[PDB]
Design a protein around this ligand. Structure first.
Ligand SMILES: [K+]
Ligand SMILES: [K+]
Ligand SMILES: [K+]
Ligand SMILES: [K+]
Ligand SMILES: [K+]
Ligand SMILES: [K+]
Lengths: 95, 95, 95, 95
């Protein structure tokens, strides 16, 4: 399960890495604001402090959202159940 | 399962196609910005770079969201489990 | 199951009705913009064309979101599986 | 199950408490607007009436979202099924 977590963890990193590269290049964001925007996008928070202004950016966001949501929320799912929960359970039993 | 994917795939396309037509016509968006807005709406990202200004638009968005979310997120679910996951698994075994 | 759908359907209506009343009264929205804002809130779309400006409004939105999301998304779930899906299946068999 | 509810209830409170403290301190929000922003963030509503302007804030929001969503939506899940639903069922049987 650490290896089930690891695979999704890597895949999410590669997914955010890619959004960072596209949005910094085509939409002109700083690398930090691209990563931020990528995370705010794929988690469906969506503040809209940053949004794509080019048509190439709008098109890529359509595909990025559809490809990216399933992954991101699977990692989060993994993270909650296989990492956060046991840690919580361990804090209720002094060793 | 390719046919379970195909049905939802088509249904999502028809759903976005329809939002594109309504928002381009009634709210005055370019066809590209209507599709974009439709996708950002039904995935619950919701940047708000575009939002409906007419009452007819606000009313349609209420119904579009309620009818559209279940579909869109079922496709995404299908896509992650029946397309992305196996592809991932295949990349871990050289042929 | 029509009665399982009916209960949630009513409960969602009562939930939106209430947001409409609070936001029209305390935040000063038109009744149509209050309902719209209520729907955009509880589905987690969240355009932000409208947002609460008073502290009483911000506090109520915290509680409304927490109480309202579970309901709204249960109705949508019901709607997709018990209404949309069978209708789809029926359209693939001429009578 | 009251104790399953209680644990998540506490954990959500501690999670919002922490966002309130970070956003009030680093981003300069009033304590009420920090809590509000924290709730609007972790539920993925995301109006964007408030968004982080510092790089330290953007970085923390990335981690807060990933750590916080699984918890918040588990509480909501608990709340809907173990509190709201039975209460609803009880209202359909006069004592
Ligand atoms: K979900
Ligand atoms: K959302
Ligand atoms: K959102
Ligand atoms: K949003
Ligand atoms: K927004
Ligand atoms: K805005």
């Amino acid at each position: 399960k650490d290896k089930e977590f690891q695979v999704l963890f890597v895949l999410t990193i590669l997914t955010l890495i890619s959004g960072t590269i596209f949005y910094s290049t085509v939409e002109g964001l700083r690398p930090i604001d691209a990563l931020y925007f990528s995370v705010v996008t794929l988690t469906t928070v969506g503040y809209g402090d940053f949004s794509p202004q080019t048509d190439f950016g709008k098109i890529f966001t359509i595909l990025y959202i559809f490809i990216g949501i399933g992954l991101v929320f699977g990692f989060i799912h993994k993270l909650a159940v296989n990492v956060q929960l046991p840690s919580i359970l361990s804090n209720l039993v002094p060793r």
